[PDB]
Chains A and B, each alone.
Chain A
Amino acid sequence: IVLYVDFKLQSGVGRCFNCRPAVVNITLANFNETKGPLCVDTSHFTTKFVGANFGRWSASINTGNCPFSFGKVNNVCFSLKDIPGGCAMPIVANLAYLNSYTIGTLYVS
């Protein structure tokens, strides 16, 4: 698993620096929305995270409704669309010591 998260701020002049980002590109590696939620084949697997980190704006994945942390190899299927009977742990775009915005959700069950 290799989740890539990224987002861009309101472009142009007179931009709102803290408003909700204008572009969002949350991309789960080797995942097809049409095929369905891809499940972890084996307990032996490496999970990386590549969120945008520019200035005070950063992107991270904080596990809220799910009692497991992304990044731990220890101990379930992961998808970007709602999977039934599962929790919704959101992906957020944080502004240091200021408002933050939910840009997308990584579902799991």
Chain B
Amino acid sequence: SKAWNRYRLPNTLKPDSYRVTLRPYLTPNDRGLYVFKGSSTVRFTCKEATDVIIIHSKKLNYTLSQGHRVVLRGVGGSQPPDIDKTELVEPTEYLVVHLKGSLVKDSQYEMDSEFEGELADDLAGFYRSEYMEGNVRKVVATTQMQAADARKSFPCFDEPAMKAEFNITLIHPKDLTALSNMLPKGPSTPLPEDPNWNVTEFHTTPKMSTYLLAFIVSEFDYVEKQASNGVLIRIWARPSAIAAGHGDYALNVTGPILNFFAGHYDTPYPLPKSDQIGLPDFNAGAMENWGLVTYRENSLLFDPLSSSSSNKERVVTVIAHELAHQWFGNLVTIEWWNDLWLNEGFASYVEYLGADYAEPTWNLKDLMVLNDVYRVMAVDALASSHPLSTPASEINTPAQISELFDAISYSKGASVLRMLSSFLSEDVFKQGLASYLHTFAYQNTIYLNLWDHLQEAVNNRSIQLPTTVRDIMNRWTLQMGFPVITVDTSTGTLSQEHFLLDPDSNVTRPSEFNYVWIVPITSIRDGRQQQDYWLIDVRAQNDLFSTSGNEWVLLNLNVTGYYRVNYDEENWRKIQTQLQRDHSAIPVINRAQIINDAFNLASAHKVPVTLALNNTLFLIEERQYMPWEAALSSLSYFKLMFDRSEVYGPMKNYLKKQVTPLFIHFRNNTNNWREIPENLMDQYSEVNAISTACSNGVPECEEMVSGLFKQWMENPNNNPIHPNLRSTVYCNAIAQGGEEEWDFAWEQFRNATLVNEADKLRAALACSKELWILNRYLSYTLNPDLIRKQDATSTIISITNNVIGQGLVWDFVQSNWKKLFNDYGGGSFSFSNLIQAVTRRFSTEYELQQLEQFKKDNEETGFGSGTRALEQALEKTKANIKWVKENKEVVLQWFTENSK
């Protein structure tokens, strides 16, 4: 009822500019706490009279001056009423200043505040990061303000629409550097009170959102290179890392990608610099802070001699994603978090446009089908998903906000962006985005504003679409899910319906469009592209989809559109024979579509499961990477359902037969594993062949990965395992080995100097088959001295991936959830990801009981960021019980027969 009890801010006060001064103490005080002292002065205009000031604040202690937590002053002759009392409302994280009188409309006011906070290792707000230089424990003060943690460093109106200018100041030790969004406004002047401390004031920022602020204080070095658009680029990181040259690669691509995005979207980069800094302790992968982008070390650094090609891809993709945010999210922000897909959906699509420019020989845009489209289809098929644009009233609390940073906003947004640019064409799509950026620069927008400017581009270019741009995209944005296109090639009929993994699931969400989509269908006939078609009705008919004799069709060419396709039994048979005759006749991207769609269709009871498994028969003579991966991905679901049952044995034998020819081929192609493929895709094919070969019991692989690891143990300094193979060779060699191999890989993980190497070691240690080792290793994941809090959740997710640890982690989660939730509430621990991963195997009514009881027990404690993930687990589990009962026998039959 009260204003300060609601989670949304009042429109009465709107900020204009901020003055902030922070001072981190990188040493523990006598209480043992790393603290930071700060002072802030915010100038705001009163748009509506009110007798109370509501401003965000979180975990902040205020110095009392003039008997109150803040001091209110006037601007331009305005009379600030006396403050009656100030209070802190913890639930909604507010700082309520009750006044004796009301404020004048159209009058500016300034509010002073002196406060203190903790420089915790919770990777949120103004937090600390630590590393080791020689034998010294270096400490760093970094920042993570997304989504609503800027209130954790200084009081402000922490909302994306409350844009303003920030006059940042950083009081740090003399022997340390201070960085921020802008460049220093003159050199650092030693603080007069104490010459052991310097002061660095930074230039005023442009109109930006609070969640984009960043204040870093480190002793890092850097490497720089003036970009092609005059922007200064700097790659900050630990001294030893910079010296060894791990930042050189990011320096090579950052500049060019930045300038590429500038030209592609006809919009310059406003700021004079863009710093890329790599923290040792970061929660997410990276943050798009305007001017000072922050990265995980594994997302920015790269060692040409010990990093893998997939690590190099990670870096460029992450950099591109972050640099794209400079335009979509920073220059043009969202009105409210409910439209998060406008920032992360654009970046997740544009990340490929930039990466393809940096490394064009990689053809990375093709991987978007597997890494994005099908990554989100698995969750968007559930009735517990959410639309791309949830209503603003449905998102209010911080938990509900952090929850939206999921595959839907990232991947489905990217998939919708893919489908949009394919039927609009890139050159046209680029146009509308340029007008959309220029208009709403330094402002905030909603999904509607985008339709307006995209519709204009259709008018200038005279593009013909079945209807307005607003009405075609509203079908994919306002309502969740996606359709399944059922084709009757005998009669050329076309049908569509809401695809659900569990046909019995109860769709609760209402849709103004009643779950009917307007999909652009692209098809091919015997390997020849047909005329594009638009489906505006629930059921249609067209000659484009009719066949006769040997003629066969395939809809959704290169999977540009975000929808699954299913054909009649006859057409499937013609496709299967075509794959056995000459699979090269099918687009490599669509070969993956055939496998992925069929498997997900079987799960939906739309086609027999025996069909999907038949589509994986041609893989025995398949050399590409993408089709094999699509199968291994869909088959991972079979591993989850059957790796604790009689069905696994036969499954391993069938895979062991399908992959062995490829493994032998790469042994001859790689000169006995001495070299790697030149093409990046083939490099990944080699790895997927080695991992699948060893996981399924090919003894030649098992004898090789063990012999390599043993050679390494003999000469630890000289690692003979090529980076691309280290990931897979490590996991298998530790599972086959014993404690002597586990301790050696543990010794390596502690003494490691490269995070890419440590990450491979950390995961591989979770492959031990000994139950006592996994139990010991689990207790390590909660010791910040042994495993970084930023890697805790990940390491636990790796142990549960082990069939011997599946029950150990589930028991661990059930027993100490509250303790695990209270301690890591809103910190370095992601609860959604862990829930999603621990429940993946549930397939029995007993497990469903355990999960439903887990929900009932901890309903008082809550789940926050994992609420939706819990419901999705409950639905996916109920579906798994039916699926296994229905297919346990038929599947076992198919694996045993085709394994011979």
Interface residues of B in 256-311 (CB under 8 A from A): none
Report whether B176 and A56 are in contact in the complex, using a CB–CB cutoff of 8 Å.
Answer: no
A101→B357 CA distance, assembly (Å): 28
Q: A18 at interface (Cβ–Cβ under 8 A)?
A: yes
Report whether B245 and A14 are in contact in the complex, using a CB–CB cutoff of 8 Å.
Answer: no
Report whether A98 and B177 are in contact in the complex, using a CB–CB cutoff of 8 Å.
Answer: no
Known contacts A56-B243, A56-B245, A97-B248, A14 near B220 by CB under 8 Å = yes
Those 7 A-B pairs whose CB atoms lie nearest each other, nearest first: A14-B177, A18-B223, A13-B219, A17-B242, A15-B221, A17-B221, A17-B223
Report whether A14 and B219 are in contact in the complex, using a CB–CB cutoff of 8 Å.
Answer: yes
Report whether B245 and A16 are in contact in the complex, using a CB–CB cutoff of 8 Å.
Answer: no
Pairs A–B under 8 Å by Cβ, sample size 23: A13-B176, A14-B177, A14-B219, A14-B220, A14-B221, A14-B222, A15-B222, A16-B222, A16-B223, A16-B224, A17-B221, A17-B222, A17-B242, A17-B243, A18-B225, A18-B248, A19-B224, A56-B243, A56-B244, A56-B245, A98-B223, A98-B245, A98-B248
Q: How far is the CB of A42 from chain B (nearest CB, A)?
A: 44
**Chain B residue nearest in CB terms to A99:** B225
Chain B residue numbers with a CB within 8 Å of A14 are 177, 219-222
Q: Mark A1-19, 1 if CB is under 8 A from B, else 0.
A: 0000000000001111111
Interface residues of B in 175-190 (CB under 8 A from A): 175-177
A residues in contact (CB < 8 Å) with B: 13-19, 55-56, 96-99
Report the interface size for chain B: residues with CB under 8 A from the other chain: 16
A65→B579 CA distance, assembly (Å): 62
A14→B176 CA distance, assembly (Å): 7
Chain A residue numbers with a CB within 8 Å of B176 are 13
Q: Mostly helix, strand, loop or mixed at chain B's interface?
A: mixed
Report whether B221 and A16 are in contact in the complex, using a CB–CB cutoff of 8 Å.
Answer: yes
Name, among A13, A19, A98, the residue most crowded by chain B CB atoms within 10 Å (CB to CB). Answer: A13
A99→B225 CA distance, assembly (Å): 10
Chain A residue numbers with a CB within 8 Å of B175 are 13
Q: Mark B193-236, 1 if CB is under 8 A from A, else 0.
A: 00000000000000000000000000111111100000000000
A18→B244 CA distance, assembly (Å): 11
A42→B184 CA distance, assembly (Å): 58
A18→B234 CA distance, assembly (Å): 11
**Chain B residue nearest in CB terms to A10:** B221
Chain B residue numbers with a CB within 8 Å of A55 are 243
A31→B866 CA distance, assembly (Å): 75
Q: Mark B726-770, 1 if CB is under 8 A from A, else 0.
A: 000000000000000000000000000000000000000000000
Interface contacts beyond A56-B244, A98-B223: sample of 5 additional A-B pairs, CB < 8 Å, sorted by A: A14-B219, A14-B221, A17-B221, A17-B223, A18-B248
**Chain A residue nearest in CB terms to B223:** A18
Known contacts A13-B175, A14-B219, A97 near B224 by CB under 8 Å = no
A99→B221 CA distance, assembly (Å): 17
Q: Mark B402-431, 1 if CB is under 8 A from A, else 0.
A: 000000000000000000000000000000
A17→B245 CA distance, assembly (Å): 9
Q: How far is the CB of A76 from chain B (nearest CB, A)?
A: 39
Known contacts A13-B176, A13-B177, A16-B224, A97 near B219 by CB under 8 Å = no
Chain A residue numbers with a CB within 8 Å of B222 are 14-17
Report whether A96 and B245 are in contact in the complex, using a CB–CB cutoff of 8 Å.
Answer: yes
Name, among B175, B242, B245, the residue most crowded by chain A CB atoms within 10 Å (CB to CB). Answer: B245
A14→B177 CA distance, assembly (Å): 6
Chain A residue numbers with a CB within 8 Å of B224 are 16, 18-19
A19→B243 CA distance, assembly (Å): 12
Chain A residue numbers with a CB within 8 Å of B242 are 17
**Chain A residue nearest in CB terms to B222:** A16
